[PDB]
């Protein structure tokens, strides 16, 4: 096995198959997880789903800013990578339904230099073309 | 559903034994090719990618069309691996990049709508620590 | 005389001096043509606007999704570069006038590997500035 | 000293101390100055603001269009700064408070070639994340 | 109406005699450039395109001001013949760029407003088939 | 208040004596670089900045997640720099680059939110005519 944050993220984010033991099996492993869906590409929209989402599932702690903080930027990573570009010219209040995942713990390695966190998305970009779809992806990994 | 984008990712981190999961796909219609560069350079993925394409049929040896496709899907896709910044790429020493390609028919239709994906799985390393980053990236494009 | 799809589109585009007798004689020659107008730069208005106007024209039977998706695809190449980069900027409700042409047949050379389609787009954007206005230009070919 | 119009311009925008004081000097010295404030981000919104704002202040006369043409392309290349990239995510009806300055004069050496101009821009753009905010940066140098 | 962009582009698919069309703009208070490389090579372009664009008056010999907006024109217009991807243009091989370039006013005023446009038209071609698609690029600035 | 970007900047135009600047700000909690690059090309000044910024301990001789901070903060204001030009900023001969580097904690909290800016202020001259233009970026990441 590999304690890999980022692998595991998009596996978790990429199986719609049992997440209740894929999830499980992480958490047995030190991790802490948390899943979702957002029906907004919008910044705002999609950085409160998931902060909340994860502060309820214990994945980040609201206690101050630091972690909250931690969590934006691997979102922002993430989503800077589902409005990749050819989804910048897509912008006219289109369909957009994405779905996410949430890890926090420790890519252990040897040293404990702290903990980490992935955000990663996947979801699906209407296209004004009806029977086409895009899909998009993206990964934001940070240090807490 | 028939998720190209998604079949590349999922054939990129599988460690399990894709020598199953090639098959299973080559028999389920796409074409395959699975490699792995160390560097994160564009020019170099590229040609690389463009090498193992070719040498597994996931490309026509020659044709401008199918050349550009595998292209763009490969640089969208880098975009992504080297987070937001192509020319720090090229900057980056000890690296790892594995790499998956499919081309194939997303819908079921009679209507080709031949498409490539081009998946990026990137590990940046340290001579010491060892991995400290981890990168991915996606490109879809029709043919 | 050249069977070049896109020069010809372009042509047929940028001259409004007798579309009539322009477009016959590329009808005479085995292609399809199709003109228009759109007064929005955006993405799902341009795409619809297009694949109706050339529907009806018989640039594109509107049967399936196979000739559908090749126009959209071409038409976003072409707005693509519309869209160039300080038209990124200017995003304010703005002013837009573009016009488009599209042309459907055979790039024949020796073989008929099949039919192409170009979608080329020529327009004018509104500056904030009373007495401005900025050129665009786009074009995007496709194989049928 | 240093006739840089740009440097200038933004030391100017940059100290929120005595710019009384730090516009006579300019003033004094053949510069014709001009601050302000807006809250948008938006082209069209910026680009009136400040067009507005100088011509009051003399900065430009509003007798034609070519001094103020000269103001738009300056103001658009310190636009296009300040809405970098990250903030082409950021783009959520969010807020934003950009401080700017407007010099005009002539950045003498030896040559009278004409008059030159700088438009700096400094500002803050609120994160979808209470207690963080990104500082934007932007200077457009043109020829009269 | 005097369209700079629109002009060039004509001059550029117009290949009727522009011998005509260079004179009849060149006085009508334009300059004009005509050139041809075999390269989609960001450098390799605008190096030919500004010795041709000096060589022919379009722009003096010297000063940052005018090469700055050639430039810049001529980057605009790259982005277009590549279809969005710079970096692939160094790439293609057995390919052909004709570029037109004009500078003069864009209305009568007395404003000089003294504008400059770029406009490219790519061929990228097959060592057999021959032309396998074509490619536009415009750039349009103030001096 | 506490602005890394706006204090970046100041330190690079403040020809003052930025000796008790930068000693006023080192006491303050900051890391400060401050250096001089004869070109715009991306590599060179990442490379001088990089040299620099060790040298100075506003980074860590190694470590890839300082060194991706600086490198992107980099990337973001040579962007302002080069006129949204990267690849021209390369083609610029005669032109001198000034930076400012400035790592540290944008409040006052205990959480290390560790960030680094980097500030550019570009001169572009000529052999002749001397200073033709001048330009400013700045990059600001968290570490
Ligand atoms: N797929 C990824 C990122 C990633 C995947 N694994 C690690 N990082 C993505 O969207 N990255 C991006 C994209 C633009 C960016 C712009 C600025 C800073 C970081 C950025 C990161
Ligand atoms: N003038 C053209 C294209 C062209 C002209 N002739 C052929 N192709 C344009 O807007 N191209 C673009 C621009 C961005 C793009 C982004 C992704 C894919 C294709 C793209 C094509
Ligand atoms: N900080 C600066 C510019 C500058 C600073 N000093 C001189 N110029 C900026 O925002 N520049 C830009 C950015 C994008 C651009 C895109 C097209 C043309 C000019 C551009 C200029």
Chains 1, 3, 4 share one sequence.
Not at 75 to 99: K, P, Q, W
Request: aromatic share 6%.
């Amino acid at each position: 096995k590999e304690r890999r944050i980022g692998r595991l993220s998009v596996l978790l984010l990429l199986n719609e198959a049992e997440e209740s033991t894929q999830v499980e099996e992480l958490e047995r492993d030190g991790w802490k997880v948390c899943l979702g869906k957002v029906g907004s590409m919008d910044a705002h929209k999609v950085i409160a789903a998931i902060e909340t989402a994860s502060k309820k599932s214990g994945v980040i702690q609201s206690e101050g800013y630091r972690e909250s903080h931690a969590l934006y930027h691997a979102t922002m990573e993430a989503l800077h990578g589902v409005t990749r570009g050819e989804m910048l010219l897509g912008s006219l209040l289109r369909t957009v339904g994405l779905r996410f995942a949430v890890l926090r713990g420790n890519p252990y390695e040897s040293e404990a230099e702290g903990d980490w966190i992935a955000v990663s998305l996947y979801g699906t970009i209407g296209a004004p073309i009806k029977g086409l779809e895009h899909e998009t992806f993206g990964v934001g990994i940070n240090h807490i």
